[PDB]
Paper text:
In contrast to its eukaryotic counterparts, bacterial [name] synthesizes 1 mol HSP from 2 mol PUT. NAD+ serves as a non-covalently bound prosthetic group for BvHSS. The interface area of the dimer was calculated as approximately 1700 Å2 by PDBsum indicating a stable dimer23. The BvHSS subunit consists of two domains as determined by CATH24: one “NAD(P)-binding Rossmann-like” domain (domain 1, residues 3–163 and 394–425) and one “homospermidine-synthase-like domain” (domain 2, residues 164–395 and 426–477) as shown in Fig. 2a and S1. The crystal structures of BvHSS containing NAD+ clearly show that the active site is localized inside each subunit.
Residue Glu-298 has been chosen based on direct interaction with the active site residue His-296, forming a Glu-His-Glu triad together with Glu-237. All four variants of BvHSS lead to enzymatically inactive but soluble enzymes. Other than minimal and most likely negligible rotations of the side chain amide group of amino acid Gln-237 and the side chain of amino acid His-296, no structural changes of active site residues compared with wild-type BvHSS were observed. The exchange of residue Glu-237 by Gln-237 resulted in changes of the electrostatic potential of the surface of the binding pocket. Compared with wild-type BvHSS, because of the change of the pKa value the side chain of His-296 (pKa,calc = 6.4) should no longer be protonated at both nitrogens resulting in a loss of the positive charge at the imidazole ring. Together with the loss of the negative charge of the side chain of residue 237 because of the replacement of glutamate by glutamine, the electrostatic potential of the surface of the pocket inverted at pH 7 and pH 9, at a region around Gln-237, to a now positive electrostatic potential and, at an area around His-296, to a negative electrostatic potential. Of note, the structure of BvHSS variant [name] does not have PUT bound at the active site neither at the outer nor at the inner binding site. This implies an important role for the residue Glu-237 during substrate binding. Under the assumption that the change of Glu-237 to Gln-237 mimics the electrostatic potential of a fully substrate bound state, the observed rigid and narrow conformation of the pore of the binding pocket supports the concept that it functions as a locking mechanism directed through a substrate-sensing feature of the “track-and-trace” loop. All BvHSS and BvHSS variants co-crystallized with AGM were found to have AGM bound to the protein surface at various sites, most likely causing the observed improvement in crystal growth.
Residue numbers in the entry:
A (entry chain A): 3 to 476
B (entry chain B): 3 to 477
Write the structure that this text describes.
């Protein structure tokens, strides 16, 4: 039967019961030992409440806010007898403030995004840079500098951000092995960064193609997605953002850097979900992705930075999302940006509605001797239904990553604030892999200059096909 | 019963029997008197042959080419008795050369595009300007100057180009009434141009939203459309192109003009089907369209040009396509441009496959005192099936326009080379309207600056909402 990894000796407080919470609950019940009454779900939605009642779990129908979060969460997380676990799978709540609360009270914490309190993503008084994921991530890095060590809190441990950091490590090890490079694999951050440098990895796309589709066609004036519509639209309206490689020799006129922080990012003064990049996955082959901002774009580039003695970066890979969502989501974006406003309604595709498809999600390492290598999951909806309830393929990649991060945090409970890049990738993938379907590594000779230039003048760099100059659709 | 407008006494030579030929043949049989044996269909495909054989129509399985077109077509066009009609609904053939051949042999001619001989659209040695529809159209204008008058040949008389020119005239008449502009209805080009100027029409979108969809979802690595995939892709890869208004204050850095010709156009050094514009239709409300080059973008702007005594244009509207095709075609474009190459396969959706939807096709006149006015057809697939066989709603708007053009040509057979802008719009719409479903005019307060600027700095002109600077989507 299914492995039971650990006993949780305290309350399990799940904040949010949308597509991810719904997928994560059965894995928590499956894989951890605890008295049933220890677990409670918090979400303001009526739809969520009804589902939770049907699953027999405690449910508190309340929005967690800046005004109530201490009065609500401190008692729930300290109910006893021992260490609890805050599993934060929400929108509209501050990941930073909830994480700090959990740590102050000795509760473990995990989330899948650095989310702000409601009001931030569309605050008109905020400059674009202040709305960036780089800025949000810097709040977490500052919190870690202020309070090193202490109770483990795992930031951004879903599928992407999350699992894809483990895929980057596995891909680096595979690339070295395929080149005939043997020996002890890296154990420190500096060793990982040097491995990427040494192998000549110029950059990395988080290269995703979701082919799930429903039994009904996309409705007019309805945004359709396979996971959070609210969350996808919010990140899609944030600036396009990327980890910025030392090899890059060009950026657009509307690109900007940061005066402070880890140093690894740029952003563009335009929305990421209306920015296209040329990319590739095994099933899609050459495709457009959307350059939607994501925590891992910054965290992976930061993690893989090599500095000189003076502290200047001498190597860092480019890293960004290149997302091709499901076809109905592609149409939803065309509709939303074309109208200039959010649709009147939205819906997240349920497994009962999906006729076929996969969520092909991996990392595309490029610029090395073998040109490009994609490593990741090809999980299908059919396999998903066989192995986990209450979710589609997109959901299961995320919920299984939360499971893996929870196992890691319980196993390493005194590690302080950590990102997915800081965890034991082998252990996390050992836990996650039963839920990932085919996990494969594929080389390709494709580059962003394939077939170019065409019949119009193009500003390309033929000396270096993987330059962002050639990737960005301009 | 259906009106039989005229007898056709000579050969009816249909070149091409794809989606539009299949929709047009039944209308020709319905609306003209003639012995069926006088019809001949020419198409290289086996698919077309079997369909033509099923209709008991004479078929020649040949590609018309620069090498064979004279030897092949002249005996067909001149078989008699009396005047033939060449109905050209093909791809890969020279509209100009075939039209000139028809005229020199006294046969009427109609087409729906200025198509070049196979090889042109992807010729790597062609300068971008030479790939433009402005350039192709100038070959037709030059032919007209060289041989004025004579046998009628109707260039670009489908739905768009074609019908939409008639919608522009009707829309101008309606705007004049609604804005209180008095005067007799224009009866000359110069008078139409002056009316557009007096009404303050800054520009015109050919504003289209196709909502047809099939019983199956879009297959991977298949381009899906409701009409010619080959044709749509070819025009989509031509430069983005537009008739250029005198009111415009800005053009992109990669815009270019023309040193010669009618003077009405610019083009952009990028493909039109990967160029977006902000536009609007009644059912879509605000939407993106693709800035795909079309003959009418140039022909309507040219027709509505006012010149001073020196010959300099003092007024001309902007005019261009703002096309939102069916959802499966939107996905097909994302796939094609994302991969950098044509899909391995394609299909045109048949009426038997389409579950619901309309082809909402009209003209959006903007900049006047009531902001913007859309006039056009909202034909549904359900209505299409009730009234005409072998086609979807896209096809029927086109085939019925060809029908209207044929009736006009038979009634005016010595008018020389003409575009849809030159035809009697009322007579043409009288013939076509039974096939157009709801034809409506709708005002809107929407403008391209609605909701802007938003969260990011935008390069907009806040002084004039309808400036191209505000319409063009700038990656
Ligand atoms: N790292 C990844 O791979 C990844 C993947 C998917 C989702 N996510 C993120 O996970 C989160 C959940 O995604 P989802 O698909 O479940 O979204 P969802 O939109 O389906 O559900 C969000 C849920 O949060 C709720 N909620 C709203 N306000 C709340 C509040 N004040 N307090 C508590 N709950 C509140 C909704 O009622 C709701 O049910 C999103 O933030 C998201 O961006 C991360
Ligand atoms: N003005 C408008 O509104 C409008 C609308 C639709 C189509 N069109 C145009 O009409 C034409 C036909 O469109 P469609 O949807 O029927 O296209 P289609 O792709 O369905 O059919 C084209 C047909 O031409 C044929 N053909 C190819 N090479 C030929 C040759 N050398 N000689 C003769 N025939 C040849 C194919 O075998 C074929 O059946 C296209 O050029 C097009 O762009 C205009
Ligand atoms: N992952 C990084 N960018 N730095 C390492 C952080 C180490 C936290 N203990
Ligand atoms: N329609 C124009 N642009 N000019 C008028 C041409 C008239 C041809 N008889």
């Amino acid at each position: 039967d299914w492995p039971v990894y650990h006993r949780i000796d305290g309350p399990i407080v799940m904040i949010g019961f949308g597509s991810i919470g719904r997928g994560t609950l059965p894995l928590i019940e499956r894989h951890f030992a605890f008295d049933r009454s220890k677990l409670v779900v918090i979400d303001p939605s009526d739809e969520a409440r009804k589902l939770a009642e049907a699953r027999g779990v405690r449910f508190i129908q309340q929005a967690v806010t800046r005004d109530n979060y201490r009065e609500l969460l401190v008692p729930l997380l300290t109910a006893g007898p021992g260490q609890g676990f805050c599993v934060n799978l929400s929108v509209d709540t501050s990941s930073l403030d909830i994480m700090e609360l959990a740590r102050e009270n000795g509760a473990l914490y995990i989330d899948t995004v650095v989310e702000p309190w409601l009001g931030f993503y569309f605050d008109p008084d905020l400059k674009p840079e202040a709305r960036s994921n780089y800025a949000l991530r810097e709040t977490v890095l500052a919190a870690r500098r202020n309070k090193p060590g202490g109770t483990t809190a795992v930031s951004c441990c879903g599928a992407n951000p999350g699992m894809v950091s483990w895929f980057v490590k596995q891909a680096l090890v595979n690339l070295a092995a395929d080149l005939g490079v043997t020996g002890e694999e890296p154990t420190t951050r500096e060793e990982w960064a040097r491995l990427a440098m040494d192998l000549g990895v110029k950059g990395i796309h988080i290269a995703e193609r979701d082919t799930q589709r429903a039994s009904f066609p996309k409705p007019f004036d309805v945004f359709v997605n396979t996971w959070s519509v609210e969350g996808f639209v919010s990140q899609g309206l944030q600036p396009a953002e990327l980890g910025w490689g030392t090899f890059e020799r060009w950026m657009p006129d509307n690109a900007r850097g940061h005066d402070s922080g880890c140093g690894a990012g740029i952003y563009l003064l335009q929305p990421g979900a209306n920015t296209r990049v040329r990319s590739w996955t095994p099933t899609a082959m050459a495709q457009y992705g959307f350059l939607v901002t994501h925590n891992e774009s910054i965290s992976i580039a930061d993690f893989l930075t090599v500095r000189d003695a003076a502290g200047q970066a001498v190597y860092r890979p480019t890293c960004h999302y290149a997302y091709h969502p499901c076809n109905d989501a592609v149409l939803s974006l065309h509709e939303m940006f074309g109208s200039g406003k959010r649709q009147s309604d939205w819906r997240i595709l349920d497994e009962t509605e999906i006729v076929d498809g996969i969520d092909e999600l991996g990392v595309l390492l490029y610029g090395h001797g073998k040109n490009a290598y994609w490593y990741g999951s090809q999980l299908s909806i059919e396999e998903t239904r066989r192995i986990a309830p209450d979710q589609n393929a997109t959901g299961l990649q995320v919920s299984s990553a939360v499971l893996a991060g929870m196992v890691w945090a319980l196993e390493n409970p005194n590690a302080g604030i950590v990102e997915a890049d800081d965890l034991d990738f082998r252990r996390c993938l050992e836990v996650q892999t039963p839920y990932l379907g085919p996990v494969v590594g594929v080389y390709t000779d494709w580059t962003p200059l394939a077939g170019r230039p065409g019949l119009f003048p193009e500003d390309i760099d033929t000396s270096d096909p993987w330059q962002f100059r050639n990737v960005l659709v301009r």
